[PDB]
Design a protein around this ligand. Structure first.
Ligand SMILES: OC[C@H]1NC[C@H](O)[C@@H](O)[C@@H]1O[C@H]1O[C@H](CO)[C@@H](O)[C@H](O)[C@H]1O
Length: 487
């Protein structure tokens, strides 16, 4: 009997403005006090947004790392590990978001003469939270492309934070690839005309993506093809549209081409930025991760409409997450997925929502491609049931008494630290959750050591990535309930 191989690391997300909207570290005493409560609970580490808009706010290459170094020093002195998100996106900007941190003003200024640097919907609405993947390789930003700006930021981060890396404080680099840091399109703009559980919209109308589609359509002998026009609008349901309805045009040749194109572009966006990240962090003992958004609504209907509009080309017979996983493989990148706290019975009937099955599909895809998989909770939860659902997903086959289980999450990150979390009943529930994730063992500061990051393997074509889509395989079997609940 040795249950050590069952331990799952638990990280906690810091507050969104751990660093102030003015790029100052102003909450040091309050955070130290909260971190003491996390250390008392046995937490392995914390996660924090490293906001592009704060650090490179002045101008190109004018990186101001002062506040972040203060924060990282505080985390180190607390004996906690650190997952750093390269947050190339806007924080907040919805009603009524308390914390609002845009991308750098000088980047946005380029959009005054070139508004097509932003993902754009079919109404022409520009989303200012992130730069279109369409401009990844366009030298529009005082001579740099978007990918070059991302690479340069990560390089400056590595150089400035080298002591924290070498000391084993920073153990994970999560590469932001879209809105909210997630590798997706902004298909569900909650403050600009989407409400849950709308199907969302395709956000591929920027002129760069239009030109790319035109070139792609021409290469297969269909210069006449255009984006689907029978797709309805953000707050529709699938049967409101000819495209997404059961037996709809999403199944057609044109529909398939478009959906492959839209989803492949996200895959290529991830691959090219991860290649850069891998070069930056080469030889450091860190995990590189991407975040996949949890689009659980409409998972139960044939079109998987909300997944499709977010950029996940996922159907009953097409595994739209295992393609992503296959692209990650060469980089030795991990999947960070959400919804690990949700039960299907917690969702409204009308949303046709299947978070449990979606989690199961994404985890199984990752594991079949040999990846490390970690999770977050999607929504704030403080109750034993939410923790017991996380536990189930953390060890789907339960505990192995003599050695490592067959499948397990590499890590779990809790959203998010606040004063509410670390007091009263919420805290008692959380501490017990951490014990159970650790298989009732104490915190192991040596757990899950990372080898020096090797260089990405050979680039593989999109055709090679897409061999992972079919045949769609059944997920690995998950226990209905955890064998090590909180109580
Ligand atoms: O962690 C990414 C996102 N996961 C799904 C949740 O429902 C989102 O709230 C979450 O995004 C939020 O937190 C991250 C991490 O701090 C931040 O980068 C996003 O901007 C924020 O919206």
């Amino acid at each position: 009997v040795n249950v050590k191989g069952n331990y799952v690391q638990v990280y906690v997300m810091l507050p969104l403005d751990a660093v102030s909207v003015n790029n100052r570290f102003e909450k040091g005493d309050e955070l130290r006090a909260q971190l003491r409560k996390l250390v008392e609970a046995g937490v392995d580490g914390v996660m924090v947004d490293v906001w592009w808009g704060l650090v490179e706010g002045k101008g190109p290459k004018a990186y101001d790392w002062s506040a972040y170094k203060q924060l990282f020093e505080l985390v180190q002195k607390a004996g906690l590990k650190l997952q750093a998100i390269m947050s190339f996106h806007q924080c907040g900007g919805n009603v009524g978001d308390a914390v609002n941190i845009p991308i750098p003003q000088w980047v946005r200024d380029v959009g005054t003469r070139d508004p097509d640097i932003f993902y754009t919907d079919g109404h022409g609405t520009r989303n200012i939270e992130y730069l279109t993947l369409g401009v990844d390789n366009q030298p529009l930003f005082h001579g740099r492309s978007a990918v070059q700006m991302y690479a340069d930021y990560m390089t400056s981060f590595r150089e400035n934070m080298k002591e924290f890396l070498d000391a084993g404080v920073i153990v994970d680099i999560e590469v932001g690839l879209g809105p909210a840091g997630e590798m997706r399109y902004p298909s569900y703009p909650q403050s600009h005309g989407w409400s849950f559980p709308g199907i969302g919209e395709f956000i591929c109308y920027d002129k760069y993506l239009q030109a790319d589609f035109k070139a792609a359509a021409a290469a297969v002998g269909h210069p006449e093809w255009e984006f689907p026009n029978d797709v309805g609008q953000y707050n529709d349901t699938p049967e409101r549209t000819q495209f997404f309805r059961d037996n709809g045009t999403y199944l057609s040749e044109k529909g398939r081409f478009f959906l492959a194109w839209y989803s492949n572009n996200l895959i290529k966006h991830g691959d090219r930025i991860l290649d850069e990240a891998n070069k930056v962090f080469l030889g450091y003992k860190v995990q590189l991760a991407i975040k996949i958004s949890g689009i659980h609504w409409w998972y139960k209907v044939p079109s998987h409409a909300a997944e499709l509009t977010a950029g996940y080309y996922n159907l009953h017979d097409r595994d739209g997450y295992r393609t992503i996983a296959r692209m990650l493989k060469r980089h030795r990148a991990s999947i960070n997925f959400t919804c690990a706290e949700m039960r299907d019975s917690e969702q409204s009937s009308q949303a046709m929502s299947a978070p449990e099955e979606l989690v199961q599909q994404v985890l199984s895809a990752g594991w079949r491609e040999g990846l490390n998989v970690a999770c977050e909770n999607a929504l704030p939860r403080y109750d034993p049931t939410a923790y017991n659902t996380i536990l189930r997903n953390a060890r789907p086959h339960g505990i192995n008494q003599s050695g490592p289980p067959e499948h397990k999450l590499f890590g779990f990150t809790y959203l998010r630290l606040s004063n509410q979390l670390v007091e009263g009943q919420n805290y008692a529930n959380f501490k017990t959750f951490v014990d159970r994730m650790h298989a009732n063992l104490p915190r192991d500061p040596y757990v899950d050591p990372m080898a020096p990051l090797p260089r990405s393997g050979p680039e593989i074509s999109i055709e090679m990535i897409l061999q992972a889509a079919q045949p769609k395989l059944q997920p690995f079997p998950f226990q209905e309930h955890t064998d090590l609940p909180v109580g």
